[PDB]
Amino acid sequence: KDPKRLYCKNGGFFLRIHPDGRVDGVREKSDPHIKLQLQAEERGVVSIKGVCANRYLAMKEDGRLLASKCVTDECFFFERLESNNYNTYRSRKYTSWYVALKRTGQYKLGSKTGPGQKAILFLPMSA
Amino acid sequence: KDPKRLYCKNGGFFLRIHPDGRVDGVREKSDPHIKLQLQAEERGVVSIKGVCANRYLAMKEDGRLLASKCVTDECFFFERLESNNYNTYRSRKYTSWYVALKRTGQYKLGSKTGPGQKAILFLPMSA
Numbered sequence: 001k002d003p004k005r006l007y008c009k010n011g012g013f014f015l016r017i018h019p020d021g022r023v024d025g026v027r028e029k030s031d032p033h034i035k036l037q038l039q040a041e042e043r044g045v046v047s048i049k050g051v052c053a054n055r056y057l058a059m060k061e062d063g064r065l066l067a068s069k070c071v072t073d074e075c076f077f078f079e080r081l082e083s084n085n086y087n088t089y090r091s092r093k094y095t096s097w098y099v100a101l102k103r104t105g106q107y108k109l110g111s112k113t114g115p116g117q118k119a120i121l122f123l124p125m126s127a
Numbered sequence: 128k129d130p131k132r133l134y135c136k137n138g139g140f141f142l143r144i145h146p147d148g149r150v151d152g153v154r155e156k157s158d159p160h161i162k163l164q165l166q167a168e169e170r171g172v173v174s175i176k177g178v179c180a181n182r183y184l185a186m187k188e189d190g191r192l193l194a195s196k197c198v199t200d201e202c203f204f205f206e207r208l209e210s211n212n213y214n215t216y217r218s219r220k221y222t223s224w225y226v227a228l229k230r231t232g233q234y235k236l237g238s239k240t241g242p243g244q245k246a247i248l249f250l251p252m253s254a
């Protein structure tokens with residue numbers, strides 16, 4: 001309900017959604033574009049909206065990330081709860097692929113993600 | 128200190144700064160792009176920063192308004208209280224021109240502004 005920041009355990013980057021739809025991670029907590037709004041769709045399914053960008057994170061058919069102005073089926077992810085309050089987000093459309101960030105803060109392509117990676121674990125935090 | 132919205136008396140529009148630098152007015156409080164940050168430069172001088180856009184309101188030489196990624200001398204305005212709790216913001220660079228919004232929510236060119244207009248009167252409010 002409240003806004004969130006998703007803190008990636010793989011180097012501690014907050015998942016960031018830019019006004020133009022680019023997706024990446026940054027460490028600066030005061031960054032306005034890491035303020036996200038998670039919305040329940042079905043049980044355990046969420047969309048992830050950049051509040052400032054007013055766009056929905058989308059997993060593309062080639063494993064790229066791009067935030068969409070309009071919701072599509074590419075914008076829904078399974079939220080699975082994991083160890084020490086960390087969540088994973090798996091594309092509903094491309095069911096082997098996760099939202100993920102590299103240790104550099106560049107996001108990790110879905111094709112290269114998988115269970116157990118540090119890259120896919122995000123901790124929701126307050127805003 | 129805290130973020131603010133500038134509520135314009137000329138039709139009740141909140142001043143909005145878009146990521147691409149466009150400036151306009153909208154009535155929806157929940158619009159993420161009406162969260163502004165006012166920063167004092169000199170006494171009674173301010174810059175006006177769109178928080179989500181991360182850009183500074185600038186008055187241009189032809190009276191256009193456009194939000195700057197970088198601060199320049201066009202980004203400073205004299206903040207003066209007039210009327211009944213409503214402020215005016217007068218360009219330091221183009222000293223006869225004010226920040227202003229039309230009754231439609233399109234912003235009014237600085238060349239067409241002047242003291243006593245409703246278009247130039249803004250009430251700072253909380254965010």
Ligand SMILES: O=P(O)(O)O[C@@H]1[C@H](O)[C@H](O)[C@@H](OP(=O)(O)O)[C@H](OP(=O)(O)O)[C@H]1O
Pocket residue numbers: 021022023024064065066106107
């Ligand atoms: O390797 P590059 O030159 O950076 O370009 C890659 C991709 O083709 C996109 O152009 C870019 O945006 P999206 O993939 O998000 O659409 C993204 O940038 P980034 O991952 O470095 O942020 C990269 O995945």
Ligand SMILES: O=P(O)(O)O[C@@H]1[C@H](O)[C@H](O)[C@@H](OP(=O)(O)O)[C@H](OP(=O)(O)O)[C@H]1O
Pocket residue numbers: 021058060061064065066067068069070
């Ligand atoms: O903005 P949206 O709603 O996400 O829509 C576009 C579309 O979904 C495609 O997947 C892709 O272009 P093509 O597949 O036609 O090449 C592009 O992503 P990309 O540029 O980040 O790869 C997106 O802009």
